[model samples]
Target: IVGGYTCGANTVPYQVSLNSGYHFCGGSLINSQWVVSAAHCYKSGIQVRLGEDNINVVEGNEQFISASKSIVHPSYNSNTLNNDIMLIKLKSAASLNSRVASISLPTSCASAGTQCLISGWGNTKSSGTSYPDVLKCLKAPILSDSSCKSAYPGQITSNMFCAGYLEGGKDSCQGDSGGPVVCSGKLQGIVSWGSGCAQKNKPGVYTKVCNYVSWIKQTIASN
Candidate 1:
């Protein structure tokens, strides 16, 4: 099942918490005024909370910004969860501080076996309802493409990639969608979908970020 530990308050400042009343999904601050998350996480009205670790307590360091606009990838598929990415343009640019910053996106794919760090306030127990208020972080290695393809044949696409263990013990659950998978300090993927949390041979799948670099840049420029 999902397994992670509480992270430092300022460990991952680029992390974003999406709330529609309550924490619904995870996101990453890719730019001062832009948040990237799973397309399915978007709704008409949602807010992005930044610069804080414990979401329940809004410290002065935290900044809550309303979304000015939401741009979901046109090719995004709900059933298959393909291209599951969305960008939230903030009403005002986030004031950069020690606890508020952006993550770097990659131009190429991550090397196989790269141990990326995934952080979220999502459920640690696969079948549990209790989610941590403080952010949790887990280090999961990127599995080989062949291994991934074999694990989920006919479903895994080039635009999607896999990362996790074959032993079936660690994963990013539902609430973790739209979160970041940071490898080598760069945003390599977005938490997309999974068969079941930490299921055997079911490594978590991610939206390969590098596959849509041009699209991301164009979308940001046009909007």
Candidate 2:
């Protein structure tokens, strides 16, 4: 994440890294066998790493598991980046522990001005390559849809929301997509898209998790 600091180890136990030989995206473990990420990150041969801190070093607490299957939202529109969420079924269930656990999904929508935590191992700079070796996090307030629309023209939808400084400097960047945006200890947003990383009037847009909670539960139940 841009303009963020290194996160404490195990502080974000539910955060997972989507890897295919290398870390590509961040995700959140919502259940023992399920991980929630962005549909745009979907691909074959992906593994989910739990309890991950530094990607460059092997942390003994890490659990690397193959993804058994991935289900991207049926209505996901690549052009609009709407319904950009995805659910990944693990080949095996993750053993819940202090350093590897699942997070609760949001029960209600996050209101504007709600301060939320965003964590990832994405690029620290928007102009060039700079993926962090360790996880990084930042706190940004949820901006209203009206503000988001004003920023993005006609791009803001009910299924999406914005969060970050209007003047830029802080936001989830490349390689951070599909990461967790937690508010009040609940999973609220999935890093989706933006014009650029932390740019002025271009706050990071996220898939509103509250609107898809039922779909997530039903998919897990039937899958």
Candidate 3:
């Protein structure tokens, strides 16, 4: 079983939501015009539900929204998993409320070893399956650039950031990708990948949000 607090078990604090009945990865509202999430979460024709608690319950506090457009990073390569980012434009701007406030994207990233928060509905144990209906969150420390590079060898790049416990038993798992990695209440990274979930010597890798600020801004402006 997952071992943390559920993301929307009782309420939706962030304007974030998931594509219903598909993956349970989290997403963030960049502004009234866009929602940012992992490209992998975009399955053709998936419906995104905002302001919801349990994915299984579609009743109170739930607001269903459909995507008007999806724009994956142009450099995204499914095989290499590079540039695994995307933006979804809703049919119209969502009505904001306490449960639906937009998250601020980072203008500058924290240096190595800074503390950050990672949250999702992934497995608690490395070998376990995805959590059924609960979303969870945890704290992680950013890996020093040198350490991250050494850990993943060729995989870690300037465009990515790494975080988690090096000793194991904590991480972003199968369902956590595309979720936010927040620092100082601003989005610093997007869950990308890792060697595995919570494995010794392996930490979660994330797409650097600050690095793509221009791209994100331009994309939202064009929409």
Candidate 4:
């Protein structure tokens, strides 16, 4: 899982920890009171260690937040990996001790062909597993709706967007699912899937943030 923050060159990103040592995907802060991550991370007895890196060792810079509520997109399908987004309501809101601030969701995402950034502590290489201590990030260009639909055929529905290097190499791998794909500081997509992590002709798939605005707003408001 790639965990961290996004800002100009000098900012340090925050990460989360899971079990004794294993970490999952990365997440984003949507507000001072909520952190956004994938639903797969919300298992029973799971702990969300925010603002830190190492899972096995507790760092004073980190804050442990309990989930007051977890809201997964209503249409999320584990089978198809659709709507794989979720919001974590903290027991208490976080304080802006530094550059750790909420990421803004785009009202309108960048049109296809625009470049975007995805970061996580996921697999650095296409075939290996996730990294334990360091967060890794990559850049990819967003694909046009027509191109994405054509490449993915029936799989590229309107609810999803496609990104990656068309020639292969560079993408979100396993355990990187649920992280954000940001363009111009706005979250336009979420790391949802790809053709086996950077395979040729198969770009990374993401949940189209624009398509789910109503659902996301309603869910967040109700919670």
Best by lDDT: 2
Say which prediction, candidate 1 or candidate 3, comes out ahead on lDDT.
Answer: 1
Identify the superior model by lDDT, candidate 3 or candidate 4: 3
Q: How do the predictions measure up, each by TM-score?
A: 0.97, 0.98, 0.91, 0.85
Give RMSD (Å) of candidate 3 vs. truth.
Answer: 2.1
Q: What does candidate 4's lDDT look like per residue over 138-186, in tens digits?
A: 7788988887877788887677888887767767877776677888888
Ranking by lDDT: 2, 1, 3, 4
Q: Rate the local accuracy (lDDT) of all candidates.
A: 0.88, 0.94, 0.75, 0.68
- Per-residue lDDT for 64-140 in model 2, tens only? 99999999999999999999999999999999999998989988998999999999999999787788899999999
Residue 50 accuracy (lDDT) in model 4: 64
Model 2 has an lDDT value of 0.94
Model 4 CA RMSD to the hidden true structure, in angstroms:
3.3
* Worst 10-residue lDDT window, candidate 1: 1-10
- Candidate 3, residue 75: lDDT: 89
Model 2: CA > 4 A from native: none
Name model 3 segments beyond 4 Å from true.
1-3, 7-12
